[PDB]
């Protein structure tokens, strides 16, 4: 699962058997670590305009 962003620590939900978290688009919002068992949260970098 490639991609860039910031890995903030979020208690999104229990996720008893789930791994991925999705949004309106095909955007993985939260992912579960493969090594340990924690719920990380994906937030994209800063956008804007000049």
């Amino acid at each position: 699962l490639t991609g860039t962003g910031v890995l903030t620590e979020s208690n999104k939900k229990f996720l008893p058997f789930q791994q991925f978290g999705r949004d309106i688009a095909d955007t993985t919002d939260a992912v579960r670590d493969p090594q340990t068992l924690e719920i990380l949260d994906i937030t994209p970098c800063s956008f804007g305009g000049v």
């Binding site: 860039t4 309106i24 688009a25 095909d26 956008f47 305009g49």
Partner: protein, 420 residues
């Protein structure tokens, strides 16, 4: 069933019979119409090829398919501010009402701004605001005019209308008592000014009752603001469909560009990437065209708003049904989310009576016609009265003018004309 167009009615028409009202009724309507919509902005490169230099090497052979979308969106965004400015910035200075509200009995406390609230907004517009309810290169720019400036504009407009009549739109504001202004407004619809002075308390009570009933009509039923709500609904749906279009394969092996780039060799990745690019280009083009058409219609709505504010708030209007059903008296603007609200105060005739008329009257072989008004008869005597309100007077040589003789007019009658 089969729809019915209305209640059937047949008037009692005859060659000598008139109906003249003997009373009136002040009514306050409400007109809602949008002014501006949301200023959105989309970045083409970030939308199509998300932070992928391999995809950005492509989409460059297509030429200038990315700058035209930005130019059109910027044009729409700068058009919205012009719409709002031309709708609201009609006044040159910022007037304010005096601290003492001696307006002849009328009560404008419901529409005047409330100093107690942190935002200087009145009660009606607070009800209006309470009645009305991403990361893929899509941004929403903030409007140039914050809601406080709009409230200040509509407060200056109300203070000018109340304290100076229509004189603040032509030159400089000239103070005038509210009763005299209302007498001038009745004089502008063909009703003698003495009617207001003789029925001032009744007119004030009717106006207060109507302005109170407006609150009950608004704060209870929320179906009135649909014309303003559907604009937001349409924009939110268009944006949602644009976002939802990123989850489509368009014939490629995957709808996400990172799996394609991390799964296929460089020489044959462009085969899928070009199809993805084409699909997203078509989706952007359709969205841009729809936004252009919607903004084109919103501009016409805003032009109508500006014309109605100019001709209806800053002065009395003689155009029929332009400012509500009935004879127009005055209007009060109110701000609203992405729109404006008018409160048209109109004069509606009331209980009427049957009479008997005559085009002219023979006195000594001469034919007297009324200067202004109509000859009527209650059965025994003949009177002259104004056309919009029953007020009989004796027929003299100051109400009528002589022209011609009796052997030409069809329907002339006999009576005596008193000479003062």
């Amino acid at each position: 069933y089969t729809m019915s167009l209305g209640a059937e009615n047949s008037v009692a028409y005859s060659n000598n019979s008139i109906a003249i009202p003997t009373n009136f009724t002040i009514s306050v309507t409400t007109e809602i119409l949008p002014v501006s919509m949301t200023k959105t902005s989309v970045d083409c490169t970030m939308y199509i090829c998300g932070d992928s230099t391999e995809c950005s090497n492509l989409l460059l052979q297509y030429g200038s398919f990315c700058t035209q979308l930005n130019r059109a969106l910027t044009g729409i965004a700068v058009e919205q501010d012009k719409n709002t400015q031309e709708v609201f910035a009609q006044v040159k200075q910022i007037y304010k009402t005096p601290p003492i509200k001696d307006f002849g009995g009328f009560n404008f406390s419901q529409i005047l701004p409330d100093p107690s609230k942190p935002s200087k907004r009145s009660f009606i517009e607070d009800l209006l605001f309470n009645k009305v309810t991403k990361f893929n290169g899509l941004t929403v720019l903030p409007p140039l005019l914050t809601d406080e400036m709009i409230a200040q504009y509509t407060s200056a407009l109300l203070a000018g209308t109340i304290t100076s009549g229509w004189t603040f739109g032509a030159g400089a504001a000239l103070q005038i008592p509210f009763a005299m202004q209302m007498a001038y407004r009745f004089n502008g619809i063909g009703v003698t000014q003495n009617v207001l002075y003789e029925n001032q308390k009744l007119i004030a009570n009717q106006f207060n009752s109507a302005i109170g009933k407006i609150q009950d009509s608004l704060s209870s039923t929320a179906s009135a603001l649909g014309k303003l709500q559907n604009v937001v609904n349409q924009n939110a749906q268009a944006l949602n469909t644009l976002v939802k279009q990123l989850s489509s394969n368009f014939g490629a092996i995957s709808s996400v560009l990172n799996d394609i780039l991390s799964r296929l060799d460089p020489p044959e990745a462009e085969v899928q990437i070009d199809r993805l690019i084409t699909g997203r280009l078509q989706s952007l083009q359709t969205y841009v065209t729809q936004q252009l058409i919607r903004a084109a219609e919103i501009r016409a709505s805003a032009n109508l708003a500006a014309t109605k504010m100019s001709e209806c708030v800053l002065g009395q209007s003689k155009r029929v049904d332009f400012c509500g059903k009935g004879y127009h008296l005055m209007s009060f603007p109110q701000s609203a989310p992405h729109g404006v609200v008018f409160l048209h105060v109109t004069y509606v005739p009331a209980q009427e009576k049957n009479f008997t008329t005559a085009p002219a009257i023979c006195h000594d072989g001469k034919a007297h016609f009324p200067r202004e008004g109509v000859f009527v008869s209650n059965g025994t005597h003949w009177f002259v009265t104004q056309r919009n309100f029953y007020e009989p007077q004796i027929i003299t040589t100051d109400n009528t003018f002589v022209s011609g003789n009796c052997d030409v007019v069809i329907g002339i009658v006999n009576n005596t004309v008193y000479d003062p």
